[PDB]
Design a protein around this ligand. Structure first.
Ligand code: ANP
Ligand code: ANP
Ligand code: CL
Ligand code: CL
Ligand code: MG
Ligand code: MG
Ligand code: MG
Ligand code: MG
Lengths: 447, 448
């Protein structure tokens, strides 16, 4: 009946749209900085939750819970980021008679301590990257494990998110220096300096499987997303299906992801991330995001399934409206994350007022955005202007259509990364579809 | 390689987008009044064709042909309206070695003299609305036929388009009066005063079938569009598939449409309009539109087929890349034509500068517009702001999702018809899916 959206930006707008499609009432929250945010305008009601820094606004749990109960909400949608993978917030909602629109706290706990997640996958017969058994207490056993696994190794925060608390070590001296750095950063960022170690995979594709469970033990997958085009770990361009994957591997990986989700009795939407090793064409579980993702639209276009609406439906108590045999991926979709950065200045942030915003339309085109003419993106959270998604019958058609779409997208007053994406789509290595995660790093797409 | 777009507005934008998908270079034209027009920005080059009134700009054939050859274009896409159903311009293009993106002039002649179109359909074994065979010489001849057909009748210009030269006669005296007014109006408008007569069908549903043929004898249909929500003759809300139609009638009408198409060796995209009579559940051919239509995108979403790209593909000599067995309509789409009119003032036109324009997005939404912030829609042409299309798995879902999308569509500075479409979507009759073409005439949505 009524849902509080515990987020901001384009995901808040997105969830709000999903609620209205189901006739659900919407409560937006905003920080002092987000006073002009679009989601606060399109919500049925909006409430200030605290000052600009996320720690006192969007992560201010007592205030979010307070507002939620005060206004008579039945649930809370966390979106992505902020409190979406926070098991304690999830538990507190439940204790308030508020439905956390997402998986259980037990589920968030199990998959949210990434070393424990791995051990759970080994027991659900899911392959995982060779590595340490749980956390390393010392550099000493980090050095011991790393010589057992073989360099290069990657040291990762077990409580980790947003790319923070991850370091490659290519020799013992790097592992020694990187251990203390990552432990420090993790304790600060997460209140948990526990680190685990993995073989650092060098030639792979980032393949992730969308899963969705209901409250009745039914789990399905909506195929894969290919998120190999990455700058500094962070995803820039996502596509569905993967250009390099055959139907037998899609099926084998989808089945692995469904085993993953039910080993932890997973409910609502999540994503299994897999490392697809191009050296032997084997996949490895890397982690689960126990939440909706930025890139969900690429999947929604090829599958025809409204994933956020399905999140709300699953939370309201609906059984899954599709079994696995009803799911098909039709056509090809590619998402471009358009940020307020200048690709001609090595992606230097570009703050300012948007003087002209003209979003493209036409066949195949979906624009996801909270930006509008005269809007100023506050520099304290994010750089996302829009996600553009192109859906065509083939990949080459999506590429041609994407240039078309991207080429008429007017965002003036600030620099954006549209030019980067236009240049990528004209790149012959990209068009070949054959490449790994290092692609941006061992090329110079901007010329 | 290079194509001139012989149109304006949102359809020029649509065409230019389809050209860029194919790697084709684009030449926009514009009237003096259309200097700010979005299609002139996104085109590769833009040229002035002349003064604001269409007669000297967008219907200026000598100037359009000069720019097409001057700039070295291979074809001309006429969109809809203006020169799209002008056989003589199609001929002229062909004589200039320009591919008219559409059917042959011969086909444009056959189906564009509407009484002859009808006669061709009877030979093609396609049902037509009862009436006269050919034109009526005289008011006397109209009187005799109208007595034979039985009142009520509708007198229709044979060279008629844009809904001019059509009026109902419920009795003799009306017919005497209607004949002369319609003959005068059709002469003025079309240079052809010839009228034909049909039974005026009073309880019906507007069901039209999308056709596409290629240059190799292949003709497919992409199912139906239901355009029953009309206001004074003009379409307002379209949906695919028709909510009141089973798949046996879908096949029947599709096969009827396909016979019609190849009866005239039809190439490229056309639409066959049927009258679906709710008294006996019978369909009758009313006319063919030998062109793409305003409402094509609702078909494109349900079928996944890019129709305007397919027009270009067909015009470059491509074999139809779809077979009939492989065409499925999936889910349900509703298009809403959003105009610069005030629905709270009986749709009074609302001229002005648009001061804020915010297109909704999200799941299932597709916006078709040439409008933007600080744009002023000239009051000289077809007054569209945007088409909004919603595509969902079911009709009820589409309705809900369209309220969502329409409710956040911001257009400030002019009044628009957005509030009418929101009131339509909350109407119980519309939601039932059961109504006929006089729905907005028997109902008053704006009071709801
Ligand atoms: N074993 C590995 N070998 C090579 N690269 C890795 C490995 N583990 C992680 N990475 C890279 O580091 C990125 C982030 O890893 P991940 O384990 O997803 O961290 P995260 O902080 O949870 N990020 P998020 O996806 O936002 O939750 C991955 O997308 C890979 O590009
Ligand atoms: N026999 C009929 N009985 C009842 N209504 C009719 C009949 N013929 C036409 N109409 C109505 O008049 C409208 C216009 O007729 P039509 O033959 O489509 O003319 P047009 O000028 O070619 N319009 P267009 O579709 O823009 O090319 C139809 O959509 C019907 O609503
Ligand atoms: Cl994400
Ligand atoms: Cl039309
Ligand atoms: Mg993570
Ligand atoms: Mg990850
Ligand atoms: Mg007509
Ligand atoms: Mg018509």
């Amino acid at each position: 009946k009524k849902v509080l959206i515990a987020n901001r930006g384009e995901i808040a707008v997105r969830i709000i749209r999903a609620c209205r499609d189901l006739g659900i009432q919407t409560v937006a929250i905003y920080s002092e900085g987000d006073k002009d945010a679009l989601h606060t305008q399109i919500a049925d009601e909006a409430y200030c939750v605290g000052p600009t820094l996320s720690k006192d606004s969007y992560l201010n749990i007592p205030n979010i819970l307070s507002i939620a109960t005060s206004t008579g909400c039945d649930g809370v949608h966390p979106g992505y980021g902020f409190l979406a993978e926070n098991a304690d917030f999830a538990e507190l909602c439940e204790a308030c008679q508020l439905k956390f629109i997402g998986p259980s706290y037990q589920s968030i706990q199990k998959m949210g301590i990434k070393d424990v997640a791995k051990a759970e996958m080994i027991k659900a017969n899911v392959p995982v990257v060779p590595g340490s058994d749980g956390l390393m207490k010392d550099v000493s056993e980090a050095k011991k494990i790393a010589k057992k696994i073989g360099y290069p190794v990657i040291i990762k925060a077990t409580a980790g998110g947003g790319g923070k608390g991850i370091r490659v070590a290519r020799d013992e001296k790097e592992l020694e220096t990187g251990f203390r750095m990552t432990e420090q950063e993790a304790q600060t960022a997460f209140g948990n300096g526990g680190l685990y170690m993995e073989k650092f995979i060098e030639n792979f594709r980032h393949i992730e499987i969308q899963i969705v469970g209901d409250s009745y033990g039914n789990v399905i997958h909506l195929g894969e997303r290919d998120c190999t085009i990455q700058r500094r770990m962070q995803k820039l361009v996502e596509e569905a299906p993967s250009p390099i994957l055959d139907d037998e591997t899609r099926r084998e990986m989808g089945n692995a992801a469904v085993r993953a989700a039910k080993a932890v009795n997973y409910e609502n939407a999540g994503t299994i991330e897999f490392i697809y090793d191009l050296n032997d064409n084997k996949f490895y579980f890397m982690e689960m995001n126990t939440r909706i993702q930025v890139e969900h639209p690429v999947t929604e276009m090829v599958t025809g399934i409204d994933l956020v609406k399905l999140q709300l439906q699953v939370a309201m108590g609906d059984v899954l409206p599709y079994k696995q045999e009803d799911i098909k991926l039709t056509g090809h979709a590619i998402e471009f994350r358009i940020n307020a950065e200048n690709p001609y200045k090595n992606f230097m942030p570009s703050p300012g007022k948007i003087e002209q915003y003209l979003a493209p339309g036409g066949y195949g085109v979906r624009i996801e955005s909270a930006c509008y003419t005269n809007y100023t993106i506050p520099p304290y959270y994010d750089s996302m202007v829009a996600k553009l998604i192109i859906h065509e019958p083939t990949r080459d058609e999506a590429i041609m259509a994407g240039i078309r779409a991207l080429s008429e997208f007017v965002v003036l007053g600030i620099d954006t990364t549209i030019p980067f994406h236009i240049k990528l789509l004209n790149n012959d290595i990209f068009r070949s579809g054959k490449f790994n995660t290092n692609f941006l790093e061992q090329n110079s797409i901007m010329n």
